[PDB]
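Re: your question from the hallway

Yes, I did run it. Sequences:
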Amino acid sequence: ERIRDLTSVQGVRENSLIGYGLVVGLDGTGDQTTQTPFTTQTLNNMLSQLGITVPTGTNMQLKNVAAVMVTASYPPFARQGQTIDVVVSSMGNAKSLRGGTLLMTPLKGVDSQVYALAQGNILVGGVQVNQLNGGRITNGAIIERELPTQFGAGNTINLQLNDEDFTMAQQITDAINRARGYGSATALDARTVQVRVPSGNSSQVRFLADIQNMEVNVTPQDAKVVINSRTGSVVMNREVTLDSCAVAQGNLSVTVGGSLQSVRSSANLNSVVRALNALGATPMDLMSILQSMQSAGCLRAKLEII
Amino acid sequence: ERIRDLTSVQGVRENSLIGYGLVVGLDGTGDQTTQTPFTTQTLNNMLSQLGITVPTGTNMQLKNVAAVMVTASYPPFARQGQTIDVVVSSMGNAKSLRGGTLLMTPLKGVDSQVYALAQGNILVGGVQVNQLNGGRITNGAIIERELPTQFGAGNTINLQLNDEDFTMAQQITDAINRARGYGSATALDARTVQVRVPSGNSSQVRFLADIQNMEVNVTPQDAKVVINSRTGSVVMNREVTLDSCAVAQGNLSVTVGGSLQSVRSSANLNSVVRALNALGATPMDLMSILQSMQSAGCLRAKLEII
Amino acid sequence: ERIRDLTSVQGVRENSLIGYGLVVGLDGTGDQTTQTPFTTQTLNNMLSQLGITVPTGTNMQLKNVAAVMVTASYPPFARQGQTIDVVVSSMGNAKSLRGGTLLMTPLKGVDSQVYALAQGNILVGGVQVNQLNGGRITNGAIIERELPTQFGAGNTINLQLNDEDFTMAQQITDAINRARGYGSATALDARTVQVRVPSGNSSQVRFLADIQNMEVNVTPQDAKVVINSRTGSVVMNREVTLDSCAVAQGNLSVTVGGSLQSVRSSANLNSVVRALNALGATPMDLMSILQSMQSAGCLRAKLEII
Amino acid sequence: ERIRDLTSVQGVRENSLIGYGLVVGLDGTGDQTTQTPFTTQTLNNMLSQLGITVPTGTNMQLKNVAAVMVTASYPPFARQGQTIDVVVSSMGNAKSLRGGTLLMTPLKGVDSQVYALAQGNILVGGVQVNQLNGGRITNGAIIERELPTQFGAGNTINLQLNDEDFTMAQQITDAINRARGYGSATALDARTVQVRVPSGNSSQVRFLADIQNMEVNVTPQDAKVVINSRTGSVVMNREVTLDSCAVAQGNLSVTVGGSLQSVRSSANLNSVVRALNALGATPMDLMSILQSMQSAGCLRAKLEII
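Structure:
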């Protein structure tokens, strides 16, 4: 696996942008403004900013405008000329956003500063039906401000691991130590590896580029079972080991001569799958069987309800 | 890939224009002015600007006029004689904009200055039905003001990368360094490359023209999976690697002998596709299976809900 | 079994994050705001933070917004640039969260400090139906604060065992003592093993990485039976031993010549399963039979109602 | 039988944790808050702790939240980083807890101190129907405080027997005396055995580990019959002896020539079963027959109504 596939850089981080705006067009299917006054209020605010002053007492029963919230994603090292994608989601009573247009929404971050301006056409999908109050605009926001970053300062860069592991951190440190000279990398914990980098933006970029594509062997992570129980999904890891036991579950019986099937000890994932398949059960029954076994041991893994 | 296909220029940036206007004609299907007084108010304002003063107390039940918002796109280095396309979207209660005409809308930017004037005929499309409250006018706006730009000043131009990558930035810098002499380009971060350019508009334009068409080999970007879950779409990258595991999902069973299918370790995208296809599942089930696996590792990629 | 599969590290611990937020989009199926005023109140608070001040007296009957609680999981040694998964669960009257979007929720820990900010798109599953008021966002929260940790201090690390056992702790201590020199590890109790580690983050990480993958033979844990009685599941351990007895249960009779079946003494799990299967009973009857036997001895194991 | 299978250690004891919390999601099927005001009150308390102050006069008719009680199990020698399973049970009017999520419940012991914090996803089972107002979370609570224990102090450890017996205590003491030197173990009563242990945590752990796996022959415990009479179960011990008698029960007659069957003297459990089976009776009749015989002697065992 490449280093980039399991590790992020300390200075490279993403930021979240939010904003409020209006979507026009829509072929009807807009907000019922009698229940969403803020749509009309913000439309009037925009019109006043453009040069039209609507009288205070007005019906304002328009159905081609929907008030929406836009979520963006400030990319690392973003420049002013860059364009980023945005997600537009209806707020009030809008039935659909099929062919609407966003109107210059100023996107704001955690520090309440306008970082981008979003405007574009919504794309939504055409029984599993599509979500038609939520759309995406590709390159629908233009950045206006730059985050001051500390990349290229000092001489230590923290490669931050995903899915923390002392062994994986040691493997990454050793791989970098073989590639470069002695003392190039040093593991700080199960998640961070400090690499000594020369001063200067260019040389740091070159070193990170060389490091990122580098291949590292992945040690066996952990015996882990994932039970969702909300989407009816069960996933078992490669290192999951199963211990000999006996399981009895409602309405289940041996094929053949009754209930209380036996489960054999199995050190391989294929053997674990075969043993759990001999115990004929649906995934819904499988979750209960797995939890009951884990309560008694009998399952050499940790199961997480996800 | 050409440099232009993955990189923008620092001085070359796009601006967003907005405006409010009226669309006339429409074969009925206009605004219900009893619920949208601003349509009548702005029509009266336009008539007064033309020389007709409507009395204050009037019925104003006209159905051939629709109040619309126009969105434009100020192109880089735009001149006064240029014409740009605009998007016209209904505001109030208009049923359609099939054959309407826009009436000299002054388009405004973020700094509230009129940059273009938009006037033209709307084009809209003729069960998947077309959006007939949203249209486009080709060359429907004429520019009137020029943005002061800093292009051609100094001696450093920032080639700004899309889809930030330290390796891609290093590749671009190295390619430019091979093409030109030493020190021509220098990577500043994962997204910016500073190229040293001679003074003068003509020589900067020549250098950028020569650089833009240049071919650069694209390194493997990243193992990444995209799940939309709103349009029912799943996309997997070329570098997505799949680790051996066992997956159980509701109503799914081995073809053949029951639930809890096995997924083999696979380092190739074709092998990943084959392994996930042996697990017979619809895309809706595939999203849940992929998320559950990623929770347990078992999927050597990062998945983003888009 | 690997040491990592049955032991956690003292400094490596997980923390729980909580937060409150809003989900927008949803294709209707949102909160009935007449019964959940806090949804509208917090939406108004967010709008005021963005720059829109809704009047106090408003209908606020919007059905595209659902108030939700987000639960996160602060990983050990977490860095600021890291992203973690979150679980979004509806609070009020929301019918579904099929295609919603979370809006910058500040996640808080036990000490009431904001540790992460959560924003992303909800994924929910497509008779066993899926839970559609509960979803998960993968990498849907970005960390903002770092827990001060004491890892890499002192010279003693406590390997903490899961499923406490004096014999297992002694086995782990002995295995480490064979691998390293004398006095490297010392068992403190049935659950803790103190390993002497050299000073420094790098060397502690290296020692823990070497120790974690190490194989240790697992002694027979304990004779234990698990009865759930809520999911209808019975699990029996490998060490469960069965003593000779006679059992009579309602509507059960010998196959063949009446009630009061006999159960033979059996020192093997397979023989125990055969003896309990000769007594033809469903798991529901099996729980009562097992509890009744345990009341009389006759069952060389402890049974837990789980 | 291993010593661990019939004996607990004096210092090793379990503690019970309790807590109150909320479960969110649930696909409706939550509390009817008009009859359970405490659900809304505690939700408002949590929101205030998060930063949202609901007005005092509110409808609060939300059906996605259920007030629950969580029961945990503080394991012996528990550390701060450990995770333990919890049981979540509905309190008010909740119809189900199918896919809910627990929200940071502080678990409390007998001394009213917070010992763990519980948060996670509930797992419940999918005519014998499952209990869907009661679920379990695996590793759903993280410990925060450590019980001060006296293990490793003094030089005497009390092996405490389950199912008290003077003969079993003597057998355990003799077995330890053969394994170690003279005076190693001394029986104090029918339930306690004092073993002399050297000072120090490490040596006490080693001695207990060596002792725990040791095999000891189990003497015949006692002639005992268990009648449940609530689940219709009758269990008879291995030492149950039956004396010659005559029994008459309603609607029962000799197969063949009428009522008042004879029961032969029988010193073996198989012979006892045969004698009671010749008397053709259902378990319900068997309980009455056994109690009536025991009133007259005729049954060389003690019967307990369980």
